[PDB]
Amino acid sequence: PQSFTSIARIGDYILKSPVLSKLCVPVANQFINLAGYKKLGLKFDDLIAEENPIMQTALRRLPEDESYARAYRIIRAHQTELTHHLLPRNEWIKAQEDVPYLLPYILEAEAAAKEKDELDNIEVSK
Amino acid sequence: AEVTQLSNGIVVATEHNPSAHTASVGVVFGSGAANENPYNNGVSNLWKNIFLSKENSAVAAKEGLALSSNISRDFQSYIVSSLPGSTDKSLDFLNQSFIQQKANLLSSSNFEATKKSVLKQVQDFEENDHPNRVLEHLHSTAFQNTPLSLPTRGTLESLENLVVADLESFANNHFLNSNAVVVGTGNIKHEDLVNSIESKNLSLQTGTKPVLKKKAAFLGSEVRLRDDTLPKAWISLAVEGEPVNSPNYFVAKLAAQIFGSYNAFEPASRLQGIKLLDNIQEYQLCDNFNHFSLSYKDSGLWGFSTATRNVTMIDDLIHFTLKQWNRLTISVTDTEVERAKSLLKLQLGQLYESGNPVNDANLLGAEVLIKGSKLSLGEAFKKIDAITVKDVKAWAGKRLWDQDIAIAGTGQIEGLLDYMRIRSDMSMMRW
Amino acid sequence: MAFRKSNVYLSLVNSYIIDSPQPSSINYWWNMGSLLGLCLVIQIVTGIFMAMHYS
Amino acid sequence: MAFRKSNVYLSLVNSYIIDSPQPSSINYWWNMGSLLGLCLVIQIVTGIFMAMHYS
Amino acid sequence: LTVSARDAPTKISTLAVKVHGGSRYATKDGVAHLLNRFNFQNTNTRSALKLVRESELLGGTFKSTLDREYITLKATFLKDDLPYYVNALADVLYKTAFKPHELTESVLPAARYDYAVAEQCPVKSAEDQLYAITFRKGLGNPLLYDGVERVSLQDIKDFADKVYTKENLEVSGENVVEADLKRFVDESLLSTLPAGKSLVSKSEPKFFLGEENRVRFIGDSVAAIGIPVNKASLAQYEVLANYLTSALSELSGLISSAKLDKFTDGGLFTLFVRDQDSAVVSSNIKKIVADLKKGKDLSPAINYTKLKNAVQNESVSSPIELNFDAVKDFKLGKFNYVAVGDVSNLPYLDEL
Amino acid sequence: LTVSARDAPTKISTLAVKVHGGSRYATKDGVAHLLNRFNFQNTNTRSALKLVRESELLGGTFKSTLDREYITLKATFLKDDLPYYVNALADVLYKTAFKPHELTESVLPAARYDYAVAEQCPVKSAEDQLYAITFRKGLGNPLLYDGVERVSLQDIKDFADKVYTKENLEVSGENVVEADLKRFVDESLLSTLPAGKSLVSKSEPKFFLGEENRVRFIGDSVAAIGIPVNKASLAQYEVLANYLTSALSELSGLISSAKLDKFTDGGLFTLFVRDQDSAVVSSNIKKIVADLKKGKDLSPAINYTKLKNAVQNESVSSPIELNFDAVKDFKLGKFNYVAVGDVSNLPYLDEL
Ligand code: HEM
Ligand code: HEM
């Protein structure tokens, strides 16, 4: 319900700042480590809720190999949570592996839908 | 631009265009298929096709003339087009074989071959061309038992009782000097056309056409020519619209242009600025639609036609387009009016300003025949630019909001609901 | 599609009492079922409003 | 097809409690709903058998 | 960058950028069709939705058409909106986005629709069979993509920057001021396009004669003959095409259609005889070739085809400037032949 | 009514009635396929369900096969059940019901399935194109019904009346007493069929050389050559067909398949090169004909040919009995050529 252009806007303003980044990105790294989705073998873009048309178009536009890897990571997380264990520590996602891979597709679909409604509520100057 | 003069009996109209490479003259009568019985239906088709016989058109081809003709509801035209230096060869042809010496055209063994090919033509129309035959059935059920209900091509049961006596009787009753405009488009000048139509002393006939005893009245009705062996479902649906010389003529054209036309398979037809598309695109309700505003002398028609293969959701297609029609009465925006203004100016510009002078001859003949002159395109644009949102709302409250409709359908129209649900869709309960 | 079909409950209402295809030839003896449903509503409502006072 | 699908009532029972596809990941907090169903049946039955003696 | 215009005191202007990028220049089969269906998708600076919803409010539409020689990018609009449309077409030529989601959602279903609508007409089948057996690897390329050889997205980008070059396009404007059009085509993105090579070859396209092909088909059956025409005898075959369909000939009731496709290096004369039953098509095509193997005096049809050529050069403005007066006689020589439909009852090239 | 049988001390008999009613003699395109798919439907006295149930309880199966020359009705069974299967085949030939509800429910979908699985192989597509361009309206008729010309039920009854005659069939039993079979094919309904005439010709089937056909196809690409063979040169092309697909040749890494179809009055040698990309099959077929146009000695492959001919005529005991001893050399003359698939990258006939 907060669309990703707003999140990216705030995050780019934080990361492009010299002071704000050096205070806030350590807190975010500790937040990511405490969150513990990586221990179940999941990247964060497997966590986003997919039942809106924006994410349905982003998942439809995602390429084939990325979609197969995403489906495997999801099925592995379900089987892991079914047994109340974690994954072995060699099977955890590393920080370099936790890449934003769906985010350009989400940002493109959101810019498309925003331009769509701004051109549906278009008004002329006459 | 257009100039129009009146000779001893004939009105002459030209649209001179000196950058054209063909010139085109002809005669446009004022009695189309709305001046027939249900029993001589198809006489104007037989005159169109004996004017374009092979032995009548071979004589025109040896002189470099190309024949054309058009049967409509109100008018009918007979056009001879050629190179700009040979306008009097065309006037000579149109005189010596259509106007005065029409006894070789109406030969038996020419009438029989032409009647046979016209019968084959309408037989292949009635079973293969589905959107146009439901537009003709929408006309035949909206205006029933009044003269506007007649198909322009005629009828297979009607056409096989026709003889040459019927053709010459219609010729005596309607091919008259009081009923005809002589048109000239292309780069023929007006003074040369009047000088060569008074150089020859051309006279058509001298009577006056019979005046019809009843005017066309819109009857809210339906007709269902259902056929489960066809792939799609073709549905035309219309209200009574404006006739020509209305004050609401261009408002009806603009209100049809608001909802426009659509094709499901062209990618730039899915991106139009119509608010109906983001209701009918999610489940792919239709293949195409087009919103028309057909204007005649007596009455008119305003509505749409669709073809769809989603035969399970026809009723929601009808429901969504009629709930989009309701917005013209209640909540049509400024932007939809401006967009339809620009698209209507483009559509009228492509219709009138086109390279073909046969089409200009048909349009100029019908317009000058019905109202004595022709409205220019600049005046048409100044009448389109003056339409406001209040004009569209007033017109839609008059002609659209809670009015009787006429429906015609063929194909798999089991999913199409009855008259009363569709008619109750014509006015929403203010929500 | 229409909201009376897209909804969970309104499609039940639609499919039973709004868009439900009935044979066109059925006569007034086919109103007895709707009549019995009205009768059942009458009995239940009046029974509750009397059981508020019955011992 | 099977009789538990080719019925009217057993189709509903099959679709809701027999062949209902559940996510395999759901923990023990996803039993509270069937627990509330059991509780509701308990309340209704014991209340009826006490209303047989309540004045 | 040949810019040409033609003024008029009227209301509708029409711009066209025509590129030598048709099927004749296609690298793989149907890349010209896929680039043509790609044409008006989104650019790097303006979406495809924004283009349509601003062109509707300015009062004009875009189209793009494919044939054997050209990819034509047409813009029909109200007369005093010209710089918007020259920048729109310049952006389409210079910077179009080429996204794979656009390939898989819009362009491939549009091309699949185009192929499925042209597949049902047996005259289009016979015409492409005729082109393919006459010219083999130039003009005889398939016109539409049907996926027999797989075209990637990189193939479409490579074809796009092969044919969208500054020497390979013309800009032609009906009802446009020519000075202002020339001022608006520079000071644009048609000045930044690569000055590539012009793909048109002034050679002769290496035809083949006496060939025959037979295609199974359900429905109407078509028998088609096809004759390649050089640059010299072009107008004799145009007079023949206008003579056979007019009322001057006794064969006009037997011929379904007859035309002459003209190019800058010759052309192809095609004749189709089509109906629903093979006995009539066999009888008719035997009568056509038995009458054309004897002479036909084409001199009655000269003024008629002068008019017809003026008519069909009103719509296009590609003038080929044909003589029509030195045309006296025709006699059929060698010809390629295509039978589409019930080919177990259509005649062979032996029997014609 | 030639009746021949070959006894054996063996548990399983088989019994074949072969009629000359295959696709060679089809009056309409695919009426033989529909009669073949119609064969073991119900007769007047016994339903088709009852035949299947009673034959299963007795222990045997029926089959009906269609090739170019024959329609074969085969019955495999346990040895002492002979007169049941004789009377079943006699009833199928004599009195089949020919009901429209059997045409539209069980025969037409089976034929549609047959054509839909034969379309997917480009080798069978190329083989029938080869037959059609070599022989035109004899053996060039299509094997399977595809509805290009509509075959009604009266056409199937007329074709069955034409070909199910007493002079047009052969009764051929294996592991069966010939005196018992000869007693059971009279004392039957095979002896009151119409004594018509045998449709086989003793002439030569009027071949055609130098022809070429190309059809597009999505999938594998097949380049095929085909050579019509007269009766006296049959053994040489059989030694060639077994030489080209054995290890004696340098070409069977390139040749996907090669065979020789033998009829009474000649045959057709077919060769197929098949791959998934067109460059491989193009260079392969160029190499095959470039080194078959120079000669080949086939005398190494004579004993191998005698072996393969023995193992492929062990099945049917009406073979052709070629000599194989006088074959030495082969040189490729003229031949018909078929491209299937990516036809604008496969070579043409004049490039071979
Ligand atoms: C199925 C529908 C019902 C039927 C057929 C029915 C029938 C009856 C009948 C015949 C009586 C006797 C009336 C008399 O003779 O005076 C009665 C009485 C009564 N019913 Fe019902 N009833 C129904 C539903 C209900 C319900 C649902 C309630 C309670 C909520 C209820 C509450 C009562 C009460 C309180 C009486 C008390 C005596 C009286 O006031 O008449 N009824 N019922
Ligand atoms: C929704 C489910 C129900 C709930 C939550 C509920 C709740 C309660 C509660 C809290 C009490 C008070 C218990 C006490 O303190 O003594 C009570 C009493 C009672 N309930 Fe219910 N009840 C339910 C269903 C029913 C039903 C359906 C009936 C009738 C058939 C019923 C009949 C009674 C009666 C008769 C009492 C009387 C006092 C007693 O015996 O305890 N209950 N209920």
Q: Are strands F221-229 and F336-341 parallel, antiparallel or unpaired?
A: antiparallel
B343 with E59: Cβ contact below 8 A: yes
Chains near E with 3+ CB pairs less than 8 A apart are A, B, F
A115, A120, A125, best to mutate vs chain B, most B CBs in 10 Å: A120
Q: Is F134 within 8 Å of F279 (Cβ atoms)?
A: no
Which CATH fold topology does F218-352 show? Cytochrome Bc1 Complex; Chain A, domain 1 (3.30.830)
Contacts of C34 (CB under 8 A, 6+ apart): none
Residue (of E19, E2, E3) closest to E73 by Cα position: E19
Atom of ligand 1 nearest to the CA of C50: 35
E42, E54, E101, best to mutate vs chain A, most A CBs in 10 Å: E101
Show the CA angle centred on residue F9, arms to residues F3 and F15, nearest 5°.
30
Q: Which helix (H) or strand (E) holds E263?
A: strand E257-263
Residues of A within an 8 Å Cβ radius of D: 77-79, 81-82
3-state secondary structure of F207: coil
Rounded Cα gap, residues B5 and B182, in angstroms: 10
**Which residues of B fall within a CB distance of 8 Å from A126?**
338
Task: Please check whether residues B96 and B57 belong to one and the same domain.
Answer: yes
Name the phi and psi angles at B417, rounded to 5.
Answer: -75, 180
Report the first-to-last Cα separation within chain D, whole angstroms. 53
3-state secondary structure of F215: strand
Q: What is the DSSP letter of E106?
A: I
CA dihedral of E276, E282, E284, E285, whole degrees rounded to 10: 120
Q: Are strands E212-216 and E336-341 parallel, antiparallel or unpaired?
A: parallel
Q: Are strands E169-174 and E2-6 parallel, antiparallel or unpaired?
A: parallel
Q: What is the DSSP string of E177-221?
A: -HHHHHHHHTTTTSSSS---------S------S-EEEEE-SS-E
Burial of E141 (0-12, 13-18, 19+ CB in 10 A): buried
Interface residue E152 vs chain A (CB under 8 A): no
Alpha helices in E39-152 (DSSP H): 48-58, 82-94, 100-102, 108-119, 122-134
In the block, tokens 């996204």 appear at E99
Rounded Cα gap, residues F173 and F185, in angstroms: 11
Count of beta carbons in the 10 Å neighbourhood of residue B200: 12
Helices F82-94 and F178-185, interaxial angle, to 10°? 40
C54 Cβ closer than 6 Å to some ligand 1 atom: yes
**Which residues of A fall within a CB distance of 8 Å from D27?**
81
List, edge to edge, every strand of the sheet that includes F257-263: F212-216, F336-341, F221-229, F266-275, F257-263
Strand partners, B188: none
CA dihedral of E18, E19, E20, E26, whole degrees rounded to 10: -130
The resolution of the experimental structure, rounded to one decimal in Å, is 2.8
Q: Is B345 within 8 Å of B384 (Cβ atoms)?
A: yes
Strand partners, E270: E226, E259
Rounded Cα gap, residues B269 and B288, in angstroms: 10
Print burial letters for E79-91: b (CB count within 10 Å at least 16), e (below 16).
bebbeebbbbbbb
Q: Which helix (H) or strand (E) holds F62?
A: strand F60-66
What is the three-state SS of D5-34?
CCCCHHHHHHHHHHCCCCCCCCCHHHHHHH
**Residue B95, domain CATH:** 3.30.830.10
C44 Cβ closer than 6 Å to some ligand 1 atom: yes
Domain boundary among B202, B218, B245: B202
Atom of ligand 1 nearest to the CA of C44: 27
Pocket-testing residue among C39, C50, C52, C54, ligand 1, by greatest number of atoms within 8 A of Cβ: C50
Contacts of F147 (CB under 8 A, 6+ apart): E218, F30
B17, B271, B344, best to mutate vs chain E, most E CBs in 10 Å: B271
Q: How far is E26 from chain A (nearest CA, A)?
A: 28
Task: Please check whether residues B39 and B144 belong to one and the same domain.
Answer: yes
Rounded Cα gap, residues B276 and B269, in angstroms: 12
Contacts of B171 (CB under 8 A, 6+ apart): B47, B102
Give whole-number Cα distances, E190 to B295, E163, E166, E169, in Å.
45, 13, 7, 10
Q: Which long-range contacts (CB under 8 A, 24 or more apart) does A60-67 make?
A: A60/E101, A61/A105, A61/A108, A61/A109, A61/E100, A61/E101, A62/A101, A62/A102, A62/A105, A63/E100, A66/A101
Residue (of B285, B309, B305) closest to B293 by Cα position: B305
Strand partners, E174: E6, E14
Helices B314-330 and B249-259, interaxial angle, to 10°? 130
Count of beta carbons in the 10 Å neighbourhood of residue C53: 6
Give whole-number Cα distances, A71 to A42, A105, B148, E326, F30, in Å.
10, 17, 64, 74, 49
Alpha helices in chain F (DSSP H): 31-38, 48-58, 82-94, 100-102, 108-119, 122-134, 153-163, 178-185, 234-244, 278-292, 302-313
Give the total number of structural domains in chain B: 2
Q: Which long-range contacts (CB under 8 A, 24 or more apart) does A121-126 make?
A: A122/B273, A122/B335, A122/E53, A122/E57, A123/B334, A123/B335, A124/B334, A124/B335, A124/B338, A124/E57, A126/B338
3-state secondary structure of E273: strand
**Beta-carbon-side half-sphere exposure of residue B29 (alpha carbons within 13 Å):** 29
Q: Are strands F2-6 and F169-174 parallel, antiparallel or unpaired?
A: parallel
Q: Is E178 within 8 Å of E4 (Cβ atoms)?
A: yes
Residue (of F254, F245, F250, F246) closest to F280 by Cα position: F254
* Closest C-alpha to ligand 1, atom 35: C51
Pocket-testing residue among D50, D53, D54, ligand 2, by greatest number of atoms within 8 A of Cβ: D50
Strand partners, F229: F267
Rounded Cα gap, residues B29 and B292, in angstroms: 25
Annotated domain spans of chain E: 1-211, 218-352
Contacts of F269 (CB under 8 A, 6+ apart): F226, F227, F228, F229, F237, F240, F241, F258, F259, F260, F261
Count of beta carbons in the 10 Å neighbourhood of residue E78: 18
Print burial letters for F318-332: b (CB count within 10 Å at least 16), e (below 16).
eeeebebeebeebeb
Q: Is E260 within 8 Å of E348 (Cβ atoms)?
A: no
* Closest C-alpha to ligand 1, atom 3: C43
Count of beta carbons in the 10 Å neighbourhood of residue A89: 7
Instruction: State the Rg of chain D over Cα.
Output: 17
Chain Cα centroid distance, residue F320: 15
Contacts of E26 (CB under 8 A, 6+ apart): E32, E141, E159
Q: Which helix (H) or strand (E) holds C3?
A: helix C3-6
Chain Cα centroid distance, residue A58: 11
Reported residue count of chain A is: 126
Give whole-number Cα distances, A62 to A47, A95, A99, A110, E96, in Å.
15, 22, 14, 15, 21
Reported residue count of chain D is: 55
C51 Cβ closer than 6 Å to some ligand 1 atom: yes
* Closest C-alpha to ligand 2, atom 8: D43
Instruction: Name the residue in chain C with its Cα closest to that of B279.
Output: C1
Reported residue count of chain B is: 431
Chains near F with 3+ CB pairs less than 8 A apart are E
Interface residue B273 vs chain A (CB under 8 A): yes
Instruction: Name the residue in chain A with its Cα closest to that of B272.
Output: A120
C49 Cβ closer than 6 Å to some ligand 1 atom: no
Count of beta carbons in the 10 Å neighbourhood of residue E108: 17
What are E17's two structure tokens? Answer: 């950028």
What are B313's two structure tokens? Answer: 């959701």
Q: Is B27 within 8 Å of B94 (Cβ atoms)?
A: yes
Count of beta carbons in the 10 Å neighbourhood of residue D14: 17
Residue (of B384, F30, E229, E196) closest to F38 by Cα position: F30
Task: Please check whether residues B114 and B225 belong to one and the same domain.
Answer: no
In the block, tokens 């210079």 appear at E94
Q: Is F347 within 8 Å of F279 (Cβ atoms)?
A: no
Q: Is A66 within 8 Å of A101 (Cβ atoms)?
A: yes
Question: How many pairs of residues across B and E have Cβ atoms under 8 Å apart?
Answer: 108
**Which residues of D make up each annotated binding site for a ubiquinone?**
16
What are F202's two structure tokens? Answer: 């003793």
Q: Which helix (H) or strand (E) holds E223?
A: strand E221-229
Chain Cα centroid distance, residue B275: 28
Q: What is the DSSP letter of A93?
A: P
Rounded Cα gap, residues B180 and B190, in angstroms: 17
Count of beta carbons in the 10 Å neighbourhood of residue F303: 10
Phi-psi region of B230 (alpha: psi -120 to 50; beta: other; left: phi over 0): beta
Calculate how far, in angstroms, residue D30's C-alpha sits from the geometric centre of ligand 2.
26
Rounded Cα gap, residues F193 and F94, in angstroms: 6
Rounded Cα gap, residues B239 and B242, in angstroms: 10
Rounded Cα gap, residues A22 and F8, in angstroms: 96
**Which residues of F fall within a CB distance of 8 Å from E214?**
132, 213
Q: How far is B319 from chain C (nearest CA, A)?
A: 8
Name the phi and psi angles at F228, rounded to 5.
Answer: -75, 140
List, edge to edge, every strand of the sheet that includes B23-29: B2-6, B11-16, B180-186, B23-29, B76-82, B66-71
> Solved by what technique?
cryo-EM
Rounded Cα gap, residues B227 and B241, in angstroms: 29
Helices E31-38 and E108-119, interaxial angle, to 10°? 120
Strand partners, B239: B302
Show the CA angle centred on residue D42, arms to residues D41 and D44, nearest 5°.
65
Selecting from E37, E77, E307 the residue whose C-beta is nearest the C-beta of B64 gives E307
CA dihedral of B71, B217, B302, B295, whole degrees rounded to 10: 40
**Which residues of E fall within a CB distance of 8 Å from F148?**
216-218, 341-344
Count of beta carbons in the 10 Å neighbourhood of residue E322: 18
Interface residue A76 vs chain E (CB under 8 A): no
Q: Is B217 within 8 Å of B146 (Cβ atoms)?
A: yes
What is the three-state SS of chain B?
CEEEEECCCCEEEEEECCCCCCEEEEEEECCCHHHCCCCCCCHHHHHHHHHCCHHHHHHHHHCCCEEEEEECCCCEEEEEEECCCCHHHHHHHHHHHHHCCCCCCCCCCCHHHHHHHHHHHHHHHHCCCHHHHHHHHHHHHHCCCCHHHCCCCCCHHHHCCCCHHHHHHHHHHHCCCCCEEEEEEECCCHHHHHHHHHHCCCCCCCCCCCCCCCCCCCCCEEEEEECCCCCCEEEEEEEECCCCCCCCHHHHHHHHHHHCEEECCCCCCCCCCCCCHHHHCCCCCCCEEEEEEEECCCCEEEEEEEEECCCCCHHHHHHHHHHHHHHHHHCCCHHHHHHHHHHHHHHHHHHHCCCCHHHHHHHHHHHHHHHCCCCCHHHHHHHHCCCCHHHHHHHHHHHCCCCCCEEEEEECCCCCCCHHHHHHCCCCCCC
Q: Which residue type, as a one-letter code, is found at position F329? A: D
Q: Is A8 within 8 Å of A110 (Cβ atoms)?
A: no
E147 with F218: Cβ contact below 8 A: yes
Task: Please check whether residues B39 and B162 belong to one and the same domain.
Answer: yes
In the block, tokens 């980008």 appear at E157
Q: Is E311 within 8 Å of E345 (Cβ atoms)?
A: no
Strand partners, B291: B304
* Closest C-alpha to ligand 1, atom 13: C47
- Residue B81 structural domain: 1-202
The answer to whether the Cα torsion of B113, B116, B122, B125 is positive or negative is negative
Residue (of F128, F127, F110, F116) closest to F26 by Cα position: F128
Interface residue B385 vs chain A (CB under 8 A): no
Strand partners, E173: E5, E15
Rounded Cα gap, residues F14 and F89, in angstroms: 12
C37 Cβ closer than 6 Å to some ligand 1 atom: no
Q: What is the DSSP string of E306-342?
A: HHHHHHHHHHS--------SS--EE-----EEEEEE-
Q: Are strands F12-19 and F169-174 parallel, antiparallel or unpaired?
A: antiparallel
Task: Please check whether residues B48 and B154 belong to one and the same domain.
Answer: yes
Instruction: State the Rg of chain E over Cα.
Output: 22
Task: Please check whether residues B139 and B275 belong to one and the same domain.
Answer: no
Q: Is B13 within 8 Å of B3 (Cβ atoms)?
A: yes
Say yes or no: do domains E1-211 and E218-352 share a fold.
yes
What are F98's two structure tokens? Answer: 């020919």
Q: Is B28 within 8 Å of B76 (Cβ atoms)?
A: yes
List, edge to edge, every strand of the sheet that includes F169-174: F2-6, F169-174, F12-19, F71-78, F60-66
F345 with E136: Cβ contact below 8 A: no
Instruction: State the Rg of chain A over Cα.
Output: 18
Helices F234-244 and F302-313, interaxial angle, to 10°? 100
The answer to whether the Cα torsion of B132, B137, B140, B142 is positive or negative is negative
What are B170's two structure tokens? Answer: 């219609």
Show the CA angle centred on residue E342, arms to residues E339 and E347, nearest 5°.
50
What are F322's two structure tokens? Answer: 């070629």
Q: Is F244 within 8 Å of F305 (Cβ atoms)?
A: no
Give whole-number Cα distances, A111 to A16, A118, F61, in Å.
22, 10, 68
Report the first-to-last Cα separation within chain E, whole angstroms. 48
List, edge to edge, every strand of the sheet that includes E12-20: E2-6, E169-174, E12-20, E70-78, E60-66
In the block, tokens 């035809």 appear at E207
Contacts of F233 (CB under 8 A, 6+ apart): none
For the CA of D42, the nearest ligand: 2
Q: Which helix (H) or strand (E) holds E257?
A: strand E257-263
CATH 3.20.20.140 fits A1-126, yes or no: no
Thinking of the domain E1-211, which architecture would CATH place it in?
Answer: 2-Layer Sandwich (3.30)
List, edge to edge, every strand of the sheet that includes B261-263: B221-226, B406-411, B233-240, B300-308, B288-295, B261-263
